[PDB]
Structures are given as structure tokens and as C-alpha cells.
Design a protein around this ligand. Sequence first.
Ligand SMILES: CCCN(CCC)S(=O)(=O)c1ccc(C(=O)O)cc1
Ligand SMILES: [Cl-]
Length: 474
Amino acid sequence: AFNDLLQQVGGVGRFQQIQVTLVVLPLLLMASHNTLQNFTAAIPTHHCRPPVWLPRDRQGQPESCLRFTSPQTEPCTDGWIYDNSTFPSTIVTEWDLVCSHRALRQLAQSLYMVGVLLGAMVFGYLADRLGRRKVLILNYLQTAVSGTCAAFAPNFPIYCAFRLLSGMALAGISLNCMTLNVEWMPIHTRACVGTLIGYVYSLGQFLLAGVAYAVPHWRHLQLLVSAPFFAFFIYSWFFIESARWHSSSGRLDLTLRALQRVARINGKREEGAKLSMEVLRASLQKELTSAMELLRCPTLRHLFLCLSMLWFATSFAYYGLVMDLQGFGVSIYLIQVIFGAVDLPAKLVGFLVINSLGRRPAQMAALLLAGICILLNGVIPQDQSIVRTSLAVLGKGCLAASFNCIFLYTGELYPTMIRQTGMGMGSTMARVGSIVSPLVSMTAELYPSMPLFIYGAVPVAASAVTVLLPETLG
Ligand SMILES: CCCN(CCC)S(=O)(=O)c1ccc(C(=O)O)cc1
Ligand SMILES: [Cl-]
């Protein structure tokens, strides 16, 4: 069928190398946006601005947001004095998100993930109607414009609104980056394309660490990260629309003109000449010839409820650990580098294990170790720095490996008639976990160590539900 035409037109040739590289390139800045709150919203040490004046906690530091009424307690009313030695200006220092507004920092991150969740749902449907190239162009422009306006937001509600729209646009690019590349690649390569995207996203953690080290101002950093998406919109007009979508849309005239252009780039002009309407109609016989069944059929229910738990738990604990970089005693400019560095060997071990033993034993190992490492982190006293840092790095490594393991597992358990819906609805649960993770982080005011326990007790429970899945090997 269609797979033969791509092989006939040149397979993986010059066009595929140019297009896939250009489409996947913006994924470097994807990790620089989700994690950006660690650098544009860091909390420097703040002691209350005097009108001797500042009571001290039993540790010894000046108490946060309590000052003596008369010189040697009353809450701050003249503002705060921040530490300008390592963080010049973050959104916490710009709008006093310190004591009565601790949750306002986490709420802004939660509102961003609502954009990511809403972006995939809306722009996923919009892609199937206006194409994959047109939606990608509109997402490149929206990400650049909405990201830029956040760097100039005069009010906190304006900052949240212009970051929610950035999250809405940044889900469309990630979703369409996979679709526009997979559809132009042969079927047997589809497994490799998903791996490349994850590794490309992995290198994005390094880029954020490098940029945030040289441009610490939050207004400059937010603008600088969203600046390149203007250049990703200028060259987005030269993409070649996915020919598979054109054939499915019923416009077989377009899919002949799309394939011939690929033949010219790939150099197989003569084989491109043989293409015509009549051969296209005959070859594309099975191409032109629903989530409701995912909740109705009994045998498919057991997969959806189970698989939604692994997707949710893996992402819920991933963003409950990535966003905590300041409680380790090491500079965040180094922990972020280490966090992205452990991503690669952990994924390689994950790929090595599944091919060696299976998928179910790999899934239990990936999550339970992450749940144990996170849980042990909370009990271990903060005095230990190397011990606590090692556990968190090891925990984030497993959760990175769990993402690859659960992505391949979803693509092999769901039947081919449902996979597109099952994978699409599977990743939606992942974005739901990213929303709830900051909200769970907001309860640290009720109990200092509660968020770590919830971030650890969830993957442990998920490791106790992955035993209800048929392993796929051979
Ligand atoms: C199903 C999407 C998962 N995501 C969460 C969306 C809010 S993601 O941010 O795009 C991501 C994170 C990490 C890795 C990895 O390292 O394996 C891959 C993808
Ligand atoms: Cl996503």
C-alpha cells in the first residue's frame, strides 16, 4: 500500500534527512520551556524589609516574613529584601510571591500544564482537519508570540495567561512533530523515530542549563527561549505536507504532487514519473477503505484503566522531582546538568533490559526503583547532600527510562485498530499528571515532607498494577 510508495519514491533519502532534522530541531527548546520555572521562578533568600528588627528561627537564619513591631511580631508591610547575589530578578522577586503567595508560584506552573493538556486535545483535532503543516506553522507563531509577551507581562495574571497560551501551542508542536515525521517514514522505522524524539528532548535539558547560567534575568531568559521560535516559523513554510494525510483526506490529486516532489529531492525522478492517478488509486486501496469502544469492550477496558495508571504515575512523579532543584545544597546550574546527563545512560539501560528480559519485569524495575529512591529521599535528613542528590538523580533516571518503556509497551499491547486512539488517550493521562504534580507540591505548607511521600507512594502503587498486563516479547 502506501508503505511501498515511500520505498519506491526513495525510502529514507535526502528529503527525509532534511525534513526530520528541521521538524525535530525545535524539540531542543521543549524541555527548556516545561522546566523553565526552575530558573525564572527561583526563590532566593528573603528577609523582611525594616520600616534587631528581624526575629530568627531556631536554626539561626532570619525568619521569613516576620519582623518586630519595635526595635529590640507583625507580618511584612513594606515589602521584602531579596538576595541579589545568585538570582538577579525572578518572578518571585518581581511580584512578591514569597509567604502569603507561596502557592502562586506553583499555580502558575499548573496553569502552564493546563495549556499543554488543552493544546494536545485542541490542536490534535485541528491537525486532522487543516493538515499537519498548517497547524505546525500556527503553533510556531503562537509559541514565539505568546512566549515573548510573558517576558513583558506587567501583572501576574497576564503572565499566567501568556504562559497558558504558550503551553497550548507547545503541545501542538510536540504532537505534530511526531505525526509529520512518522507519516513520511517507512513503517519499520516508526519505532526508531519515537526513540530519536525522546533523546532529542533529552539534550534540551543541557541547553536550558547552559542558557540559564549565562542569562539569569527572568525577563531576558523568557524572551531568549521564545525568540528562536520566530525563526522556526519563517522556515516552517517550506515543509512538505504529509502525503499520507492527503490521501486519507480524499484529495488524491495533492498526494500525487506531494510524492513527485519527494522523488525530485530523493533523486529518483524516473521512479517518480511512473506515479499517476491510476496507480495511486489502485495501490491506496486499504487507506481510503473511536474512544467509545475503549470504554465499552471488556477486554479493552482492562488495558485502558491499567495503562492510564502507568502513564499518569510516571509523569506525576517525573514533574514532582524535576521541579525541585534548590533543596539539594548544590547549585541548580549543576543539578540540572546532572539531571540531563543521567537521562542518556538510563535510557540505554532501559533499552538494553527490555530486549534482554522483557517488558513487564522492566516496567516494575523502572517504577518501583523510582518510587523507592524518591521515598528514601524524604526520610533521609537534609543534612546529607551527596546522599540525597544521588538518590534523586537515580530516581529521575528510572523515570526517564520508564517513559521509554511505557511508550513502547503501549504501542504493542493495544491492537492496531485502536493504537492511535490508545496512545493518544494514553499520553493525555501523562499531561494530567503534570497538572496535578505542582498542586500536590502546594501542600508542603500543611506538612513539610508531604509532597515527597506522595511523589513516592504513587509510583509504588503503579508498580503493583503493571502485573495485570500481558508482556510482549517475540
Ligand atoms: C507523553 C508526553 C510526555 N511528556 C509530558 C507532557 C506534559 S514530555 O514532556 O513531552 C517528555 C518528557 C520526558 C521524556 C523522556 O525523557 O523520555 C519524553 C517526553
Ligand atoms: Cl505532550
